[PDB]
């Protein structure tokens, strides 16, 4: 148990500040508020929420779901908060490690000359439009995808 | 302060079910835990179930675990204990807790909890 009650116990998945630091954060009240708040997952992505944002019993764990080329906040719209509340708001995802299949060998395609050729970047940026998301970046030497959303 | 006000207790059937509700109210309660609690004469309150209400999230007692269900409805900030098959020994004072906070309690503990109910009554007539 976190004395913030903050749930994450799944491998890979980090927060920044870490856990261990927002386990030594908890306030007079009780409470555990950060200015920026990461939730990450080592070799699949991250998520960046600018401004002040209470994690005091945040259920991550059930929360939150990084995964290949698809990030989930939120598993249904039942228990969806309302705009502005939880992780309900704008947020900056980062998804690694995400490269085309090459159709010779189904082998994936990592070469930035070659993802360059084939313009892979306007895959993903027509892909984030048809979402309702923003475009950020597609930096291929990591495969990471960047696009913001205004809310989950 | 926060208040706490449960309803749907009283008397019913053995085999029967009862819906207790607990309405909370006096700040947001986006980043809280609630759990309903019970107190049969001259013993210590046991835990029921919990409920974290920035997923929606539950689990159960095992005592309780397939007979009792925890669910909530958001927009009116209520949360609700669906109990089915009731017996004598589920005679007890229903108590609906909070927390707002952090804790180094677990979320089976009494201690856990900041804010409480007044309790209501269930009585199982055979």
Known sequence: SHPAGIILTRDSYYTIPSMEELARSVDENGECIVNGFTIGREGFGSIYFEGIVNLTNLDLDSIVHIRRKEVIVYVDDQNKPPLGEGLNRPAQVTLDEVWPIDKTSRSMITSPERLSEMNYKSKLENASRKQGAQFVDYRPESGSWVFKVNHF | ?126
Request: charged fraction near 20%.
């Open chain 2, 1 to 126: 302060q926060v208040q706490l006000v449960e309803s749907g207790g009283g008397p019913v059937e053995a085999g029967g079910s009862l819906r207790l509700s607990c309405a909370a109210s006096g700040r947001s309660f986006s980043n809280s835990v609630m759990a309903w609690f019970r107190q049969a004469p001259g013993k210590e309150r046991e835990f029921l179930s919990v409920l974290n209400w920035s997923s929606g999230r539950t689990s159960i007692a095992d005592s309780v675990k397939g007979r009792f269900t925890m669910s909530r409805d958001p927009a009116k900030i209520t949360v609700y204990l669906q109990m089915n098959g009731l017996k004598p020994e589920d005679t007890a004072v229903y108590y609906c807790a909070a927390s707002n906070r952090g804790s180094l309690y677990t979320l089976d503990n009494q201690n856990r909890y900041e804010d409480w109910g007044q309790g209501t009554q269930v009585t199982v007539s055979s």
